[PDB]
Each structure stands twice: as C-alpha cells, then as structure tokens.
C-alpha cells in the first residue's frame, strides 16, 4: 500500500506504516514477533509486536481481542501502553495481521537485579511498581504473574509493567530475553490453590524486592512442592488459621510438613546487603510486611504506598490516577466463532 511498506524480519515479514523505520527483531515466540523500530513521526523508539496466527483457532482469536481490550483499560505512566495498533489489510475479508505498537524500554528488572542500588533508586523503582499495580487493580486487573522479566525500565530510572492479564506464553516477556519462570514469584494462595485477591501482587513485589536486595532469587523452587518448602523454610510454617483455609488433601500435606521456625528478617536481609541506617531498617520492615504467607496478614497496595520507605515519593496524581475503563470479566466467559472474533478485533483496530 501507499501507506505501508514491507520489511523482512528473519522468516517472517513485517508490513508496517511508513513512519516505523529501521525495524530489527528483539524477541520471538510461537505467539508473536517483536521488533524495535524508530517512529519518525514521534522521533522516538518503539516496540512493534506482530501477533502470530491470531485466527489459527478460537482460542488465539479470543486471546487477540482480549489483549486489545486489556490495553484500552489502562492509561498510566507505570504501565506499558498501546501507542498504536494497525493492520496492513484493507478490508475485513482480507484481514489477517494485527500489529501492536508500544513503548520501547531499555531493560527488564533482571538487569537491575545485579546492580547495587542506593535507597533512592530502590524505593523509587518500587514506588513506580506500586503505582502501576494500583492502577491495574483499579481497572479490575490483578496481575498474579509479576516477575523481573515483565517489569521494564529506562536509563532515566522510569519503570513500566507489561503482560497484565496475558497467559504466560502470549506475553511480550516470553518472547524476549532474559526470561525467568513465573513459579518463583507466585503467592502461596496461588500455588496452594486457595484463590486470591489484590495483594497477590504484593507477594510478587516482595519476592522481586528481596531479589534486588540479595542479588539472588528468593525462592528458587525446582517445582511447586520444592517451591512451598523453600518458602516455609525461610519464612516459617504459617499459622493454623491459614492452613484451615486449604482444600482437604493439600491441607493435610501442608499440615504434615515438618514445622519450621523460619529466619528473622534481619537474618534474611543483613545490613551487609544495604548501604542510611533508618532506610535499611525501613526497607527491611517493608519486606517483612510484603513477604507474608497468609494474604489476610499481608500488606495491601495502599499501605505499601503509605509505608515510610516508599511514601517519600508520594504524588496523589500518580497514585489516584483513575483508569479509562474497568475490565469486564464477562469477557473471560464469552464465546464467539473465529470469524466473529475477527470482526470484533477488526473494529477495534480500525477504531
């Protein structure tokens, strides 16, 4: 087309708007390919994600529409946004390809983890994560799968979350490197099948902060049995009132584990790992409130934002910024034929 041009990217071809130049592959998976590009209209770099075979089957089609709907629910500087969405095909009948354009960031938290950070940068990165997470929650989106590889950063110390609401396979994070498995970051209520609420994301933030501090994965379980053990060995055997909430067989498994005292937080995060004396105490205290097995006793997002270690950055405009829409979960249980999903997606793309 006059507006589009084609560029070969390994074994696929990107047909994109002419404003997007110098495309180069930065990530790839069975579910999509991501290129870095220069956006000549904005004079900014951009990430372009081409969905792979979105109409292969009903599942992929529903997933494609859902990704698009999730992106319109949010509008916050600590959450990746959809700068643009397009298709090079000119009618519904020819319609096949969907391209998503998002901000190109510089690294994910895997890179930050190995760095030694002052309290200002540590707390500020955490504060941005929390602002991002609060916004998702206000939009009816609970992430559940937060981890260093789906949190991205820039050299100006800004931070954005990606892959909210996406299956851990259709996400941008899965397509790119470095990558870490989600198992290490999942809350006890998730791995023990108890159901979860908003502060499921606080546990993950705690695991990530813990890893930024220790420069090593907090709970590197080889599987979900190992995962649970690693948690209890370090944090201690949870209270009886927590265990009573468990389903019958898993409750007995958990109750029959040897009883562990668990290490104190000064033991888990010694001064050795921190730079100033009030700030290390404050960080350790925040950690001891996020890394709490029982969600009923775990700190919420609002209280985390109010915590002394984080609160220094508080700006009500960043915290109380409301989402454009609230995600309708009736979408999760909606059925359409592929052709019907395709028309729905097409309308959203041409919107």
């Amino acid at each position: 087309d006059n507006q589009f041009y084609s560029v070969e990217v390994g074994d696929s071809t990107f047909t994109v708007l002419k404003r997007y130049q110098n495309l180069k592959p930065i990530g790839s998976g069975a579910q999509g390919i991501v290129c870095a590009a220069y956006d000549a209209v904005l004079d900014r770099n951009v990430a372009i994600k081409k969905l792979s075979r979105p109409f292969q089957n009903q599942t992929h089609a529903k997933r494609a529409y859902r990704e698009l709907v999730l992106m319109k629910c949010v509008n916050h500087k600590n959450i990746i946004s959809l700068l643009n969405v397009f298709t090079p095909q000119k009618t519904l009948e020819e319609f096949q390809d969907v391209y998503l354009v998002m901000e190109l960031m510089d690294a994910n938290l895997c890179q930050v983890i190995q760095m030694e950070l002052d309290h200002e940068r540590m707390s500020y990165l955490l504060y941005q994560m929390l602002c991002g997470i609060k916004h998702l929650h206000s939009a009816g989106i609970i992430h559940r799968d937060l981890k260093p590889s789906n949190i991205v950063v820039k050299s100006d110390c800004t931070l954005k979350i990606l892959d909210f609401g996406l299956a851990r396979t259709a996400g941008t994070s899965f397509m790119m490197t470095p990558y870490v498995v989600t198992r290490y970051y999942r809350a006890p209520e998730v791995i023990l099948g108890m159901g979860y609420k908003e502060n499921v994301d606080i546990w993950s933030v705690g695991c990530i902060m813990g890893e930024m501090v220790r420069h090593k994965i907090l709970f590197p379980g080889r599987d979900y049995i190992d995962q649970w053990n690693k948690v209890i060995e370090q944090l201690g055997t949870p209270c009886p009132e927590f265990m009573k909430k468990l389903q019958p067989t898993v409750r007995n498994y958990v109750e029959n584990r040897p009883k562990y005292a668990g290490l104190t937080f000064p033991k888990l995060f010694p001064d050795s790992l921190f730079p100033n004396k009030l700030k290390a105490s404050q960080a350790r205290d925040l950690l001891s409130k996020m890394l709490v097995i029982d969600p009923a006793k775990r700190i919420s997002v609002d209280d985390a934002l109010q915590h002394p270690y984080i609160n220094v950055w508080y700006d009500p405009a960043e915290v109380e910024a409301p989402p454009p829409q609230i995600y309708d979960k009736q979408l999760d249980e909606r059925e359409h034929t592929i052709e019907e999903w395709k028309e729905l997606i097409y309308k959203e793309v041409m919107n």
Partner: peptide, 10 residues
C-alpha cells in the same frame, strides 16, 4: 526531594 533521573544500565 529530587527523584533519581538516571539508572546505570548495561
């Protein structure tokens, strides 16, 4: 306070 405006990424 001033927010950090840089991050020493590799």
């Amino acid at each position: 306070v001033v927010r950090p405006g840089s991050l020493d990424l590799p």
